[PDB]
Amino acid sequence: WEQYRDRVNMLQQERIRDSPLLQAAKENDLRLLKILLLNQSCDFQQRGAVGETALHVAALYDNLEAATLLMEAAPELAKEPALCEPFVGQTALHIAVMNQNLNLVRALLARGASVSARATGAAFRRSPHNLIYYGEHPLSFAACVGSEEIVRLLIEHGADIRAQDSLGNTVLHILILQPNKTFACQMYNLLLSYDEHQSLELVPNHQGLTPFKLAGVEGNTVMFQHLMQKRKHVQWTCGPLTSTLYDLTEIDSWGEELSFLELVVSSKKREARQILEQTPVKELVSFKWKKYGRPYFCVLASLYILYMICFTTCCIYRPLKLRDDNRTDPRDITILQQKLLQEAYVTHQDNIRLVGELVTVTGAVIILLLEIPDIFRVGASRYFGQTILGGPFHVIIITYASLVLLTMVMRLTNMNGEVVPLSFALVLGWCSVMYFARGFQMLGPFTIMIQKMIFGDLMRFCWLMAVVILGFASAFHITFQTEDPNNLGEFSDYPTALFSTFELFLTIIDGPANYSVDLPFMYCITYAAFAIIATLLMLNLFIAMMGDTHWRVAQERDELWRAQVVATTVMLERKMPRFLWPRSGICGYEYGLGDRWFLRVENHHD
Amino acid sequence: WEQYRDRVNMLQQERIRDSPLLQAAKENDLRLLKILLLNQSCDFQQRGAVGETALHVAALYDNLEAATLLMEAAPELAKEPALCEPFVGQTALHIAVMNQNLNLVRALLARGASVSARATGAAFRRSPHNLIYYGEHPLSFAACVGSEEIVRLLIEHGADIRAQDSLGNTVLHILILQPNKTFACQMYNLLLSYDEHQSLELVPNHQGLTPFKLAGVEGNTVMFQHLMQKRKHVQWTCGPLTSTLYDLTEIDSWGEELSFLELVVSSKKREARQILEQTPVKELVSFKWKKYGRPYFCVLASLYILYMICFTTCCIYRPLKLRDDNRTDPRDITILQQKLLQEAYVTHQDNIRLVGELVTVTGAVIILLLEIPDIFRVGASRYFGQTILGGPFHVIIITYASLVLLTMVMRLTNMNGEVVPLSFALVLGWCSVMYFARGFQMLGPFTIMIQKMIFGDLMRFCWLMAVVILGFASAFHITFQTEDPNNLGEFSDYPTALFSTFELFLTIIDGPANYSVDLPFMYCITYAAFAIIATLLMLNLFIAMMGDTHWRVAQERDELWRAQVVATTVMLERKMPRFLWPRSGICGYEYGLGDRWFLRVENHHD
């Protein structure tokens, strides 16, 4: 791993030391270099640790004067990479580019060094083990570092721009994957000035990504809005206002399957949501939402509520049966029992329950007939993790459907215990209405920070509560096991004492007391310590920790709410049949423009 | 709508393209223009999409050199607006003003273009569909944009300043309705220098608004205090202090009905409250309040409290009657009943109740005899929405009066159920005392932010509570319907279980337990989840959301409290007879000034 990378770099620094020819290279001891060049029997194709030549050493330590004499030593040395593992294709041209010495690059080009040298090393790959990704070809090394004349010399001496590598990246691909510099935009415009016609913009990678969609999914918006200015068009300027229009053929990608906008919203980096505030893209989603999205979304929520109330009233009128067995037992309350199947359907009230049950059991299966093909499309963790896409809301409803399917099988076998799996689905179905709270302005931003705060702090409080409840519960169970439970019904055995301490921790039950009789001695001294450590420190610090997290993450939840309505917007028009979805934008075919779609916008300024 | 405005602007840009004469106009292809002007059979009164001429195109695209030759083409083209819908009166003078080209305006005036061209288009109106309102006449277009020599040329060649339009606005009206510029004040002083005598300041609009009241209701206080400096008068300066006085005839408007101050406080924009902190207006309302308003307001509140306690003690001694019917029913408590009318008045204690009831029923009608004429004066939403004017306080008291009138009709018919409408009026009458809490310093600012916070967050919490209570209440009702309600009186049927879960959500009732008998199994596991999701997450996040809203809106509620005492001040002296309201200010008729009223103020500075 990293340690293996350490050991080889330690190993190289003694191969550079033992050879005096190689040592005088890095030390610029050109007198001894003249002495060894006066010698003939000295080998010149010597190697260090990793396939080395002296030219790599001279390029690393920037002693060009020795590198001059190394050409008349052997001119063939400039046409050779290394041979060992991490630097398997690296030539001295790459080091000369990365050290910015125009004269030495000119001298290497004078010896006819191969411009198209392909260097695919271990360090030359996008990796968290690595720190720097500069592409693969020396054009990429020239463009990333910000030189301008060296790439002119390369284009002068070949250097085909349409050059692919591992992962199928281009020069314009790797220019996007950089920290922000003005030099990146300048070199982008410079290379676009040289290459002209197909176009370079159409080629994807091995992942199938155009550079426009690459810049979209990464989110260098400075490059993005500069790139779109080649496609804008002003209309007319008069007074302080200005009419203009944009092309949206590249933005929509209607005929394709992988749309641009869905690819943007299905990202992993945090900065990808920031690109949505650009002006030609914000107006499209706003015009789409405020015309079609809100009415199409407000309607079916009422249908879902109408489904849930019918499910609830089906769950109410459950067939019961009087208990035939005599109970005859203290600490026992059994008065009813479950009716069998063959007695369950006689009345007209029974006949109502058939169509009550049938609507629920047919609403169960359409949940699985809606998103199970969406499971195999995107990744599994790429379907559950995204809070923007509504992560846990999709996983709770499929469990609701699984439970309501399981109880129908349970009814057919006359299996007892019907109530127990039914109650989980009953409590989760009304929690499932929370998904529809997104499309409301006053309610939407509120219901996501609670989801944040559960996985932020509820476990933190929960582990600490569970470790502190146990010894107190054990102590209260020990200190009453010589007593009558008829007078103190709490703390009778261990498991109900555990629940009693849990209820008393949350200040729900009152403190137990029987003033007619006597109490044990140390109960009074062990209870007050639990009281002052539980009610005064735990919940109050929980409130105090909640208050700061609400205050500091108040800004991100504001922008994050409008960041997820567009996911619902692109989701709804993806699954509904598009005769209810006419095309947004202007069809310019009625004006002789031809097969392109546009959006008009004006802007007052100054 | 907006899309209709899109389609016409798209349509115009092909009519400009198809005509080569019109295309060479916008492209300044003056060689082909010389070719077509050498032609005679080519039409010169050609039209584009919307009543167009080539001069509009030349003025839009600022190619004056073609517009020179267009005059010798046809000089009559400079005297023609368009004919279609949105630009129905627009002439090239307006575009020439809005593009600021003095030579082209001079050339159009050389052809005798009509200065008083009236352009009333669709876009030329105050509308949220529009973005820019620049008045109607070319004087307004000159004044809004900030030119100075062009309006001198217009006044040189006519351009009557007293010019009305749609909505009856003047130049000084539309200068107020602008974003803040020093140029607005400069052009205001410039036009005031030209026009001098009646005066221009006296004319209203069709709404009946002087420009002074317009600037008051809008609140460009930079223009306001600059405008009042023409009416101030310094008295004497000696040392670091300075005596002066102001005229208040325009501010008071005593003889009129629509007063300036009430028109200011009955606004809709948020910035209109800011004008109250100006120095000649703050001293007037402070001198008025601290002398007359507070004593006149503190007195009748005690009378209202004395009314309410008499109403309460009338509600206590209600005529009862022993129940004649034998109850004989478990789960039933009926021991008293209602006395009839003919038995209700025999005693002297009954005789006290007549004059107890009569004061209440005559205090009922004077509420309707106080503000029902104020309903038809201002708008209905303009009477209920303003929290400054006390919105819901007026609507609760009229319901109180309606209920106390309805119960008197109910008593005359011996109708049962008298207590039920009585209790609503009983609980609302003591809530109605909250209106009088405005005039106290330590109490006033506190009682308005609660009104803010109800409609801010109580509904947000209420929807979320109502959606989460239902499934838990249904689950607790299902899990006990095989049991004895004699041992657990909660959760017997559905509707009392719904209320029991509501009380247990607010931690009012303790958790139910009967240690002598056994519990169902899954009750213990379903209760703790509701406990940790209800008592630990809902109310605590409600507190945390309350704490930030109290902190961030703490500043606006401070200034807003003194913003509403002046509404009470102008309200009280509007309805009381003015022999208890002598005139504020100084009557300068005793000093030979003559029929004007003044206020003295001094100012220490430096």
Swiss-Prot record, chains A, B:
Role summary:
Constitutively active calcium selective cation channel thought to be involved in Ca(2+) reabsorption in kidney and intestine. Required for normal Ca(2+) reabsorption in the kidney distal convoluted tubules. The channel is activated by low internal calcium level and the current exhibits an inward rectification. A Ca(2+)-dependent feedback regulation includes fast channel inactivation and slow current decay. Heteromeric assembly with TRPV6 seems to modify channel properties. TRPV5-TRPV6 heteromultimeric concatemers exhibit voltage-dependent gating.
Assembly, in brief, is: Homotetramer. Probably forms heterotetramers with TRPV6. Interacts with TRPV6. Interacts with S100A10 and probably with the ANAX2-S100A10 heterotetramer. The interaction with S100A10 is required for the trafficking to the plasma membrane. Interacts with calmodulin. Interacts with BSPRY, which results in its inactivation.
Query: Which residue windows are intramembrane?
Result: 492-512
* Enzymatic reactions: Ca(2+)(in) = Ca(2+)(out)
State the species of origin. Oryctolagus cuniculus (Rabbit)
What regulates the activity here? Answer: Activated by WNK3.
Tell me the residue ranges located in the Extracellular compartment per UniProt.
Answer: 317-353, 411-416
Instruction: State the ANK repeat positions.
Output: 16-46, 50-79, 88-117, 134-163, 167-197, 207-236
Mind telling me what this protein is named?
A: Transient receptor potential cation channel subfamily V member 5
Residues of the region (Interaction with S100A10) are 566-570
| Membrane-crossing residue ranges in chain numbering | 296-316, 354-376, 388-410, 417-437, 461-481, 525-545
Give GO cellular component annotations, separated by semicolons: apical plasma membrane; plasma membrane
**UniProt KW Cell membrane keyword:** yes
Glycosylation sites per record:
326
